[PDB]
Enzyme design. Structure first.
Site, PDB file in Angstrom:
ATOM      1  N   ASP A  63       0.830  -1.210   0.000  1.00 15.68           N
ATOM      2  CA  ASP A  63       0.000   0.000   0.000  1.00 15.68           C
ATOM      3  C   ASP A  63       0.865   1.261   0.000  1.00 15.68           C
ATOM      4  OD1 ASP A  63      -2.850  -0.907   0.022  1.00 15.68           O
ATOM      5  OD2 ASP A  63      -2.368  -1.695   2.005  1.00 15.68           O
ATOM      6  N   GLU A  94      -4.761   4.673  -0.727  1.00 22.09           N
ATOM      7  CA  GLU A  94      -3.651   3.769  -0.447  1.00 22.09           C
ATOM      8  C   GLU A  94      -2.937   4.137   0.849  1.00 22.09           C
ATOM      9  OE1 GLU A  94      -2.885   0.917  -1.567  1.00 22.09           O
ATOM     10  OE2 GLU A  94      -3.860   0.735  -3.501  1.00 22.09           O
ATOM     11  N   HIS A  97      -5.175   2.875   3.531  1.00 22.98           N
ATOM     12  CA  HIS A  97      -4.969   1.417   3.677  1.00 22.98           C
ATOM     13  C   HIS A  97      -3.744   1.131   4.510  1.00 22.98           C
ATOM     14  CE1 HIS A  97      -7.173   0.678  -0.403  1.00 22.98           C
ATOM     15  NE2 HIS A  97      -7.920   1.284   0.504  1.00 22.98           N
ATOM     16  N   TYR A 101      -3.251  -0.633   8.914  1.00 20.70           N
ATOM     17  CA  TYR A 101      -2.498  -1.720   9.536  1.00 20.70           C
ATOM     18  C   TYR A 101      -1.827  -1.279  10.833  1.00 20.70           C
ATOM     19  CZ  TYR A 101      -3.566  -4.160   5.265  1.00 20.70           C
ATOM     20  OH  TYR A 101      -4.232  -4.759   4.215  1.00 20.70           O
ATOM     21  N   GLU A 154      -2.857  -4.573  -7.560  1.00 21.13           N
ATOM     22  CA  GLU A 154      -4.169  -4.346  -6.957  1.00 21.13           C
ATOM     23  C   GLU A 154      -5.078  -5.568  -6.961  1.00 21.13           C
ATOM     24  OE1 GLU A 154      -4.291   0.374  -8.060  1.00 21.13           O
ATOM     25  OE2 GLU A 154      -4.662  -1.116  -9.678  1.00 21.13           O
ATOM     26  N   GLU A 188      -9.481  -1.777  -3.612  1.00 20.70           N
ATOM     27  CA  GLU A 188      -8.515  -2.401  -4.523  1.00 20.70           C
ATOM     28  C   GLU A 188      -9.174  -3.000  -5.767  1.00 20.70           C
ATOM     29  OE1 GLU A 188      -5.333  -1.925  -4.285  1.00 20.70           O
ATOM     30  OE2 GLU A 188      -5.529  -0.989  -2.339  1.00 20.70           O
ATOM     31  N   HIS A 191      -9.960  -0.162  -8.038  1.00 22.77           N
ATOM     32  CA  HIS A 191      -8.700   0.342  -8.598  1.00 22.77           C
ATOM     33  C   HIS A 191      -8.191  -0.546  -9.741  1.00 22.77           C
ATOM     34  CE1 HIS A 191      -7.605   2.355  -4.484  1.00 22.77           C
ATOM     35  NE2 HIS A 191      -8.731   2.812  -4.999  1.00 22.77           N
TER      36      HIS A 191
END
Lengths: 284, 284
Positions: A63, A94, A97, A101, A154, A188, A191
Site C-alpha cells: 500500500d 492507499e 490502507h 495496519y 491491486e 482495490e 482500482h
C-alpha cells in the site's frame, strides 16, 4: 497551461462513475471497532499471531509503495483531467490502507512483536522481490507496463495476505479486522478494474505488434510474480495447514487481474477452486 | 528502498494531528443541499450572477493547480513519511474543492454562462499572472520557496473569491453554497498552517544568511501578489460597490499567510479591517 477542471464536460463517463464509487466509499480505520477483536486475538496461538503481523506488514509495504510510487506514476499518462483526479483519490486511499495496519497493530499487538514483523518484512526475499519488480516498471518509461504492474498489484499481489483475515472471519475470529480488510478490498477491486479499463483504452491507439508484445509481457510477468508468490506463501504459512488454500486463492485472483486487463484466464478451475467459506467471508 | 509506513512511530506529532484533522473533516459537495440555493440565485442580478461564475472559475483554477502541481511538488521535500501521506490527502481534497465548483455550476447556472466564465478566466491577465507566479516556484529547485508559494496560495490567493459567498451569506443568500465554501476554507486554513509549520521546521536547518534572503523574498513575493490581486479585484468587482471591502479582506488574510510562515504582519489594522458581518459569516 493549467486549466480549471470542468466536471460537467466529462469525456469518459467511466471517470465520473469511478470518482463517485471511490469517494462515496470513503472510510477510515477509526470507524471500525477494532478493539472488539482483542478477545479473539487472545485465542490465537503465538505462531498464528506472528503470521498475522507478518502478513500485515507485507500488505502495508505494498500500500505504501502504491501511495508513494504507483498511483503517482500513472498520473502523467492520464487520458483525461478527471482520471488525474481519480488517481489522486486512489493515491490518498492507499495511504489510508497503509495507515489502517498501524491501527490494527496498535489495538491488538505488542510493540516488540510488531517491530519484529516489520524487520522480517525488510529481510524477506520474496516480499522484497515483488516490491522490486513492480517498482522497476513504475520507474520505467513504458506507460502500458506501469498499468499492467499496477493491476497485478491491486488484483493479485495482496491476496496471499488478504486470505488470512478472510479465513479467520469464516471461523468467527478477528471479525472487525476482517470488516476493515473488506473495505480495503472494496477499494482495490475498483482500482484494478479502472486501471485495467484505462490500460485497454490506451491499447486502442497502439499497433497490432506492440499489443502482441504486451500480452506476452503480461503473461510472463504474472507467471514470474506467481512463482515468487508461491515462495512467499510457503515462507509465511509453513507452520500452518493453509498453504494450498492460499495458493488456490492466488490462482483465483490472478484470473481476475488478467480479466481486468482484458485477457483470458490462465489458471484452470481445478487450480483456482476456493473454499465456499472463504468466498462467503469475502461477500457476507 | 521503500519501507512500510509505521504510524505508531511518529517522529513529529504535528503530522498525526493534521492527518487526523484533515481526514475527520472529509466532505463531498453532494453532502451539501446546493439545490436549495436556486431561489436565492434567481434574486441575483445578471451582473451579480456573472461575477459569481467568474469568481468560482478562478477558484477552480487555483484548486486544480494545487492538486495537479502544488501539493505533489512538496512531496519530495517531506521530512517524514507521515507528512508524505498528509500531502496525498491535501492533494486529493484539492481535487474535491475543484470538483465542488462544477457541482455549484450544475445546480445553479446556465451552461452557456458557465462556459463564458471559464473562457473569461483563460483570458484574465491578473488570474493567469498569479497562476504563473506560483507555478514557477513549484517548478523550481528551491524547496523553501515552494512552501512560501503554497502558503500564499492557501492563505491569501483564494480570499478575493471567498469574500463573495461570505458576503451573500451575510445577506441571507446562497447560504448552502456558503456552507460548501466554509468547508473549503476549513481545509485551506489547515493546509496553510501545516505547510507554514513545515517551512519553519525546514528553516531550522539553514544558514542565518539564507533565512534573511528568504524572509526578504517572502515579503517581495507577497507584495507582488498583493498588487496583482488588487488588479484582479478591480476587474472582478468593477460594477459593484464591494472592491474596497474585498481589498480589506485581502490584507486581513495576507497577514494570516505571513503568520503561518512565522513572520510579522505587513498590513496595519486600518487596511485590514473587515466588516463584522463578513467575519460572522466566516465563523457562524
Amino acid at each position: 497551461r493549467i486549466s480549471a477542471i470542468n466536471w460537467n464536460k466529462i469525456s469518459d463517463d467511466k471517470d465520473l462513475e469511478v470518482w463517485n464509487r471511490l469517494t462515496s466509499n470513503f472510510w477510515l480505520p477509526e470507524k471500525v471497532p477494532l478493539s472488539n477483536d482483542i478477545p479473539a486475538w487472545q485465542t490465537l496461538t503465538v505462531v498464528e499471531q506472528q503470521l498475522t503481523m507478518r502478513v500485515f506488514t507485507g500488505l502495508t509495504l505494498l500500500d505504501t509503495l502504491q501511495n508513494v510510487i504507483g498511483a503517482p506514476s500513472l498520473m502523467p499518462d492520464a487520458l483525461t483531467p478527471h482520471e488525474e483526479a481519480v488517481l489522486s483519490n486512489i493515491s490518498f486511499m492507499e495511504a489510508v490502507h497503509a495507515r489502517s495496519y498501524s491501527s490494527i497493530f496498535s489495538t491488538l499487538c505488542q510493540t516488540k512483536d510488531v517491530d519484529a514483523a516489520y524487520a522480517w518484512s525488510e529481510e524477506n526475499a520474496p516480499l522484497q522481490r515483488k516490491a522490486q519488480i513492480i517498482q522497476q516498471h513504475y520507474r520505467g518509461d513504458d506507460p502500458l507496463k506501469k498499468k499492467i504492474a499496477s493491476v497485478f498489484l491491486e488484483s493479485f499481489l495482496f491476496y496471499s495476505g488478504f486470505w488470512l483475515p478472510m479465513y479467520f472471519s469464516s471461523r468467527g475470529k478477528l471479525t472487525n479486522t476482517a470488516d476493515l480488510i473488506r473495505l480495503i478490498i472494496r477499494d482495490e477491486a475498483v482500482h484494478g478494474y479502472y486501471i485495467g479499463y484505462k490500460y485497454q483504452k490506451n491499447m486502442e491507439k497502439i499497433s497490432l505488434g506492440q499489443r502482441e508484445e504486451l500480452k506476452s509481457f503480461a503473461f510472463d510477468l504474472l507467471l514470474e510474480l506467481y512463482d515468487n508468490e508461491l515462495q512467499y506463501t510457503d515462507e509465511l504459512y509453513a507452520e500452518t495447514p493453509w498453504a494450498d488454500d492460499v495458493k488456490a486463492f492466488l490462482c483465483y485472483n490472478a484470473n481476475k487481474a488478467l480479466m481486468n486487463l482484458g485477457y483470458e484466464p490462465l489458471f484452470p478451475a481445478e487450480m483456482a477452486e476456493v473454499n465456499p467459506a472463504i468466498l462467503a467471508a469475502l461477500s457476507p
